[model samples]
Target: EFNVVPYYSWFSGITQFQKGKEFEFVEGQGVPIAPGVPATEAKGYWYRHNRRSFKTADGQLLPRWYFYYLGTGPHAKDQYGTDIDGVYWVASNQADVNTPADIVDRDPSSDEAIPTRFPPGTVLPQGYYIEGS
Candidate 1:
């Protein structure tokens, strides 16, 4: 069963979770960098907010990868306008975002050195809508 992960958002007053979804968790290939940094292979392990779900013309999921993190803290942006400790829904698409982020290759398991791709997870888990009604 899917568990309820605690995700607090000061950006919006939406504290209640609508539902959970299946997402694959990924790690960064490099050191932790600052948020709001351009998605040019800057490997930082965090969850990115996904506005919507999309599919390619060939039926492939867009925003190719995602980071598993629970956005904790009340402030959305930090002192330098950097994001506070949060997750990233990586591999995001769009011409502006450079069409997909680069991340480490591997699916993370639950309770490991990395995060999990299931509920008790974050707001938007990566894969197709599994936990939603």
Candidate 2:
């Protein structure tokens, strides 16, 4: 069965969209899976929001990677019916982001420790979306 994780509160505020239903991702652009669809036959891991933040126990800095996707179906609009496109995923060994808004200011390529490809067990740090506004 696929796991449905929730987005972090800090990241949610910046996107201005409600938490979504299911999550999953895979290498290479394959096919789009929508809600009410059977995921058992799906080929990728559900890319949902992560409940925990990426940071050290004592508040130390670390390297990380972030990934995201633009909504393609019913998610094309926001909870308020506004046309908002984009869903975000984050992965990190160490990083401190107060909110998703802060992430907007960051340079994803600045960190060398960040891997070029998605790592196993990595998932979205929270829910984030961009409304073109």
For this target, which candidate reaches the highest lDDT against the unseen true structure? 1
TM-score: model 2 vs. ground truth: 0.18
- Runs in model 2 deviating more than 4 A are 1-84, 99-116, 122-133
State the RMSD for candidate 2: 17.9
What lDDT, from 0 to 1, does candidate 1 have? 0.30
Using TM-score as the measure, which candidate wins?
1
TM-score of each predicted structure versus truth = 0.19, 0.18
lDDT of 1 by residue, 1-133 (tens): 1145323221211111333443333432222223454535432233334344355676412222233222222222223114344433332222123222333232334222232232232344334432112
Q: In candidate 2, what are the lDDT values of residues 29-89, reduced to their tens digit?
A: 2222223323232121112322344566765112121232222212312232122233333
Instruction: Provide the lDDT at 47 for model 2.
Output: 26
- Report lDDT (Cα) of residue 54, candidate 1: 53
* Candidate 2 residue-wise lDDT at 94: 30
Lowest summed-lDDT stretch of 10 residues in model 2?
7-16
